[PDB]
């Protein structure tokens, strides 16, 4: 009786098709363009031994954490390029990092299948492992804090999970994907999150209940990055077919596509600006592009790296944007 | 210019850098390897005997240190991953070599091994990474051929029209049929390797048994040759 599934699929497709009458390009056709955007490098941060995989800004817009394949976490001071801490890990194949909103903890994980939480404010002067969370059956690809006691992870196996840090257990388990889950992004009010997998689909979940809420489709290939619009009602994705897309939660549709005929490499990171007018994306051809979110025209280029750009992040007050590459350097742009 | 606390902070940063330099010294002198193979391949025996003769339930990756002639090696393998591989193989595009272990006494699961090797060889992120292949469990192949119950021509049609290459070196003295068989296996793998190399990476074959005691030296020799090739490319000699 899978015909019921097929028919329900066709019915959902039709209901989606009805609601589309105008596209975002038509409505935005009557607004002024952003023009050229020149952004120059200000600082260069040196000290990593090998390629960089992740970075994440602090809430105060000054501190910064980065992770590298040599087995280090380094906490930087962006304004002066000093080094504040250097945490040596026990497994060298790290693939993610996060920096808690309060500023007390950091997290990291990788091919070891463990999410490790570190304590930065102790009576002794060192940084000590607070807790190790185990229970996944594959590599951990992303992790994000909700508050000081809850964390959300995504794994190489199809599952995402929500942990309690005091008593280290899974309160809720999210199932439903088919391929590897690769990215994660929390809503600004911390009641929903979206995840993107290797079956070319993304899903919105509900934290309190634990059921899958909606499912979006497109993209013809893997999804490597995902991010919420500041509003809380849209998100943008990046894929291995050299395209980015923007989805909206209420319309359950797709709005615009950012693509060009010269670009043939895949996207590795996506981030929005403070107002939502600029979409920043990294690429495998060593360069980072700046797109205009409402008109789908390139506005600028950030070309300063000698290998692929792996991470990208915009600060909370909108002053700066940072990028890290496989040449083991971070660059603060403005 | 800048106050007292900022001077103390700069001092702290300079000390942190010193330690990183020390770490770099320890990291530029260690060679990293990756161990790949199937379930029937005896890679567990290799790693166990190498760990003995020298010097946690869903855990994902293992470690193994060993030393030959005062040179350090790390050897990693992946424990609790799924069947798909195209995603986490990108973390290993700077290793020195990939060690590939294939069982040569199955005759039934061998075409899958050939396909897997073909997938590793042509990966987009593994161009400029060499491969050391071990054709393990030789003696089992010896009894299997000698008994004669199980043929080989039935699974592979083109075996009849094949004859031993002129540069073969059967050392201890054994029946020629086993020599023909094992060189046919090696020639399949080397044909896949020679298809599209383009001169950027090479494949080093070996015949081994999982119990013998000469594998570390083989890896040492092959890594010597690989690093020599890279240094020729770097120092503008070719």
């Amino acid at each position: 009786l899978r015909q019921e599934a097929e028919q329900l699929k066709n019915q959902i497709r039709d209901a989606r098709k009805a609601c589309a009458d105008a596209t975002l390009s038509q409505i935005t056709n009557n607004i002024d363009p952003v023009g050229r955007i020149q952004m120059r490098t200000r600082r260069t941060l040196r000290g990593h031994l090998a390629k960089i995989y992740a970075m994440h800004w602090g809430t105060d817009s000054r501190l910064l954490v980065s992770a590298s394949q040599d087995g280090k976490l380094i906490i930087w001071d962006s304004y002066t390029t000093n080094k504040v801490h250097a945490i040596p890990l026990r497994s060298s194949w790290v693939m993610t990092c996060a920096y808690a909103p309060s500023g007390n903890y950091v997290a990291c994980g990788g091919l070891d299948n463990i999410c490790s939480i570190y304590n930065l404010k102790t009576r002794e002067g060192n940084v000590r492992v607070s807790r190790e969370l185990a229970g996944h059956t594959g590599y951990l690809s992303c992790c994000r804090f909700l508050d000081d006691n809850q964390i959300v992870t995504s794994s190489g196996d199809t599952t995402c999970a929500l942990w309690d840090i005091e008593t280290g257990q899974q309160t809720t388990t999210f199932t439903g994907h088919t391929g590897d889950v690769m990215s994660l992004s929390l809503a600004p009010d911390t009641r929903l999150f979206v995840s993107g997998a290797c079956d070319a689909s993304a899903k919105l979940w509900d934290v309190r209940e634990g059921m899958c809420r909606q499912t979006f489709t497109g993209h013809e290939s893997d999804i490597n990055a995902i991010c919420f619009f500041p509003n809380g009602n849209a998100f943008a994705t990046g894929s291995d077919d050299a395209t980015c897309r923007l989805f909206d939660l209420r319309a359950d549709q797709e709005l615009m596509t950012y693509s060009h005929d010269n670009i043939i490499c895949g996207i590795t990171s996506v981030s929005f600006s403070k107002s939502g007018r600029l979409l920043l994306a990294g690429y495998d051809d060593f360069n980072c592009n700046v797109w205009d979110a409402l008109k789908a025209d390139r506005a600028g280029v950030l070309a300063g790296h000698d290998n692929r750009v792996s991470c990208l992040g915009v600060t909370d007050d909108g002053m700066a944007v940072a990028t890290g590459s496989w040449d083991s350097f971070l660059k603060i742009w403005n | 210019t800048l106050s007292a606390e900022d001077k103390a902070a700069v001092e702290r940063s300079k000390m942190i850098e010193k330690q990183l330099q020390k770490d770099k010294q320890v990291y530029r002198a260690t060679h990293r390897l990756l161990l790949l193979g199937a379930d029937n391949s005896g890679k567990s025996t290799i790693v166990k005997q190498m760990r003995i003769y020298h010097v946690v339930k869903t855990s994902g990756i293992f470690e193994t240190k060993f030393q030959v002639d005062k040179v350090n090696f790390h050897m990693f393998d992946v424990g609790a991953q799924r069947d798909e591989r195209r995603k986490w193989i990108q973390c290993f595009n700077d290793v020195t070599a990939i060690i590939f272990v294939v069982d040569s006494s199955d005759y039934n699961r061998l075409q899958e091994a050939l396909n897997d090797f073909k997938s590793i060889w042509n990966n987009r992120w593994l161009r400029t990474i060499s491969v050391i292949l071990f054709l393990n469990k030789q003696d089992l192949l010896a009894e299997k051929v000698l008994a004669g119950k199980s043929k080989i021509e039935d699974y592979f049609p083109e075996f009849a029209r094949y004859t031993t290459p002129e540069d073969a070196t059967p050392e201890p003295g054994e029946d020629p049929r086993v020599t023909r068989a094992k060189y046919f296996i090696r020639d399949e793998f080397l044909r896949i390797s020679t298809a599209s190399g383009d001169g950027r990476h090479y494949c080093y074959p070996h015949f081994t048994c999982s119990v013998d005691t000469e594998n570390a030296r083989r890896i040492f020799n092959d890594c010597r040759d690989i690093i020599q090739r890279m240094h020729l490319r770097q120092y503008e000699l070719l």
Partner: single-chain antibody
Framework: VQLVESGGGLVQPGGSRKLSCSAS????????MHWVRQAPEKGLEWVAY????????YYADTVKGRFTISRDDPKNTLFLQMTSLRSEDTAMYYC??????????????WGQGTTLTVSASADIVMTQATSSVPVTPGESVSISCRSS???????????LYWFLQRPGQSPQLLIY???NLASGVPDRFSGSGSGTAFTLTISRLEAEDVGVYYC?????????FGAGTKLE
Amino acid sequence: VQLVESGGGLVQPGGSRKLSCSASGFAFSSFGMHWVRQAPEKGLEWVAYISSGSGTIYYADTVKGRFTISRDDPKNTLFLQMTSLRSEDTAMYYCVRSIYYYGSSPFDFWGQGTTLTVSASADIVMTQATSSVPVTPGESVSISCRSSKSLLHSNGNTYLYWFLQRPGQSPQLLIYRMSNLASGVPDRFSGSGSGTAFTLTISRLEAEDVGVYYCMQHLEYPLTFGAGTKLE
């Protein structure tokens, strides 16, 4: 964490002695160390400072050549070598711990002290007001302070510190860098200021808040303290 230190007793004028401070319970090698002294009934005065890595040392004006400071990381001990001891050196010496990075809190732990009795310019000055305020429990008090040169820096930081010394024991940190409550202090305390004049305020006093309040500056060496005010 605890620092326990010993040395000292009656000693003749003109001699020399060596003081030691034993540390345990924390990572000694990544902290700076200070020595702070006070006379039998007067206030505090700074003595020396040795940093992590032993690459930076400072001394006061009155001990510029007689004293010498050193540390021993693997044995986890701090030393102060005194030579040619006059009679103005009778005081009680303290062992204080300090770390410096963005957002840290210097001067946060103080050790107990060793008594030492000897038988018979262009630097910032900090002035305390009238040194006595009678108070009844449950009221509110407004201890004040003053300075000569402005302590505000182009960073945006203001370097002023506050300490409390109960009758029995060694001082405790309350406010660091003019507006931050140190870890472990109740939320009753609060402090503010305006660039040259400063103020510390206590909301609803309790029976364990009586003592002497000292101020401190950290803009440039040497570090000057001020007389302090008592509460009864």
